[PDB]
């Protein structure tokens, strides 16, 4: 009635929390509850939407304004809008960030701290988490005009290397190379919108550049020194330059506005780690300009 | 041609070789294997929120002495998606990795308990659902807080009400410095999408 | 003879017998106020639009009403500049005499509608954005709309507010609170807190004595309401 | 006949007593017995009832007297019975405790100990174990009258904040706000009982206050300092105030008694821990008033 | 509802990486990935031979 | 007199020490109880194949 043991010797390895960084597999976390079958309900009557609000098809499908342009009669034709934006007329196609503003405080009489502050579209904000991306971009360019402004406006794609200006702390585009008659727009994919009665256009740009995935570095640490990752992150740029000059009477104003929206469809990503040389630090606005921000460091 | 404005929305497209959804399967099958779809799945992976948390010996410490600090930074995935949403429901799994220069003249052990949110140390009792580990034989403390709330959902950083859902209390005996990692439980999910706040870049701090 | 328990609206009695009640001989109909209008229920009465605010913009502009949206917000002193701030539902309940018609109730489950009637001349352009943010003055500082960038402001839910294309917007601000059924007595409701931002500055001819006006107005009313528990109080 | 091992390496974590605080799951406690299949019988012929005597539907369904009121001809109308009870006429609807008595002993010439002693209905006594509650309350108000006492008595609900008086050590209700003509009873849910031949009434009050569960703190540590938990625990109060004054001849006595019973149906609770700032200490009556009670402390 | 343990005492040997030099058998190497079912594709369209 | 432990992380190829972050998919062992660190790097590439 008490026989001997017939089972073999079960081999062993002592690994507490084996593979904890995976979203699948039964985990040994002890619930501090009354019931082991602790089951919360479904998503009914809790969040007042019925849309599944966390899929990347919906999070990155959220439109955000990137640029607000001022297109004048002073500005020439066949040349993008150079406004001190500084990107403005040259919008880089691609999901991660491309712009930055620099906050300069003081520490001592001869030392300062230059903290890079980036804007974040919701397509951009997801891509900072992941390392390599692949996404079909979208842009909805809208002219804010009166009933009387007319003209013809051209938006053309260009694949590959974006013309730049490396500076000590930022990268600006180079409108010396996109003018003329030195860079024609006769072979690129283009769209010629009409300001007579047409207003909006959505320009879907699918993903084509010689690699399976680009990088999500973008503008982080992009300067005169380290600017390889900025080139290998976009597959080129849209460019908004006017074919025909703005025709406006003296009654209406000579300035119109071009609002560039942005999102990304069909988004797929690769690794759940940031490719940047720093953790995902969310910028908290200081109360007074004399105060600085705590910096996350890389020791363990 | 008349003086007026219309809307006439145009979804005009560039390069149109093949359907987009078909090439994305073929691109990830040779570059990834893994196919990341839903951000709900990233609230199940334990990303380390701190690298060092030097806890003073013999003190019932609430994790809100660390959670108020570490929900600002957005280092993990819980506090980085604390900016794209407003509400949350579900319990927070915690794992504690011991990194202490242990001493043989003591018997080191670790407790854990429950407090409701944002109470202080002495204003709660100790008999509740507990858990205990011994870091000589088991360096990992495998604890999951359930979702015991008055309300069906919770907004972030609420008003002068307090003690409206439950969280963790962490009791030890010796001055154990640790690693703390976390993610939500099986039914942890956000909701009510808003737009995202800003980001912070590199802070090299050049002299002029 | 023993069982006299009758029921009013929300009220019950307990007598020994039915106390020998006399009434009208025949209930003949009289003057025709029923034939002039149907009776408006209290759920029907909290669906009337009210004229709340009347915002006039001149470009201009010396004032804050045409400071455009900042591309970056570097510090809390230079917060995001707006036009007006409606702290729902504490604005829509006080105005239009609604709070003197939902007195002696306790809990409310509303959805606030917002409509903007807009009326400007053809020689003026511009664009605005009507964003709402729940718990915008309750959450921590970095999460509010007034501290994020221009891409972060516009990423909040809302609607475009162009002049020449949109003379009316319809936005449905949902029941967006964690508490079931808003409290009224000793009320500190202020859950969803609305905003109005100009994206581009309003544009007109730079020569003055021309009067380039805008003249926005705001209508709000409740929807899908349920008003449940009776009390004796109320806040004034 | 002795082949090699084909099983994989079984991973391992050394957790003795994994999840001991759960009522389900096979536990490793060794029986100190002769038989591993140690099976006690069922509940037949052991306890002399057949009712399942531990379900919360039956434990909290046990009626207990809370208040004994003295309603006089001296007392006015449209005003609750203020008797130094001190609650008396204002019974807070809700499952946990609301009353306390304070025991004052001596330690030194200038130091004393004030120990809070609470009464315990069986609906109250279960709720001290759990943290958050939700229950459909019940009350059976009975008039102890003669054959000759008549009158009309009103019991009306009120949802929300109960009027109070914070003192140094206890909270009393505020009969200055429930009198008049300054607090009408024309819009509340009410019942108008008749003392002519009707005697009893049971007034079931379901659970309605803007939250899924209230708290089980009640009166523990309720004073001038810490009285947030007392407000967020009840969903208001019943109020017994007379419509018409007591009509009694000189033969029968001018004092009648109103006995307020209490239980709770459909009870559900949330966490098996006390929300109070102290363990569940059961008050043991001392033999002599000069002796004090041992106090449970919070170290481990 | 919380009965006693009925399983026998499982015997034990502490051998981390038992038989690592064999091309067959399930190995305990932890993937540093998002998905436990991390599956690369087949050999189609990668190497330009068949 | 110490508590020895081992971490592991990911970098893309041929980066140096300080020019990468640390929050990524990790693994941890304790060599007092487990002398073997059992780690597998996945194949997260931009290109379908890599020359040497």
Author numbering:
A (entry chain C), D (entry chain C): 1 to 300
B (entry chain A): 1 to 208
C (entry chain B): 22 to 257
E (entry chain C): 1 to 50
F (entry chain A): 105 to 156
Give the published text.
The major capsid proteins VP1 to VP3 of IAPV form the capsid shell with pseudo-T=3 icosahedral symmetry, whereas VP4 is a small protein attached to the inner surface of the capsid.
Genome release from IAPV virions results in the formation of empty capsids that are the same size as native virions. The structure of the empty capsid could be built except for residues 1 to 21 and 258 to 318 of VP2. There were no changes in the positions of subunits VP1 to VP3 relative to those in the native virus, and the structures of the icosahedral asymmetric units had a C-α atom RMSD of 0.98 Å. However, whole VP4 subunits and residues 1 to 21 of the N terminus of VP2 were not resolved for the empty capsids. As a consequence, the volume of the capsid cavity increased to 7.0 × 106 Å3. However, the loss of the structure of the VP2 N terminus and of VP4 resulted in changes of the distribution of charges inside the capsids. Cryo-EM reconstruction of the empty IAPV capsid shows a strong electron density located on 5-fold axes close to the inner surface of the capsid, whereas the volume is occupied by VP4 subunits in the virions. We therefore speculate that the extra density belongs to positively charged ions, such as Ca2+ or Mg2+.
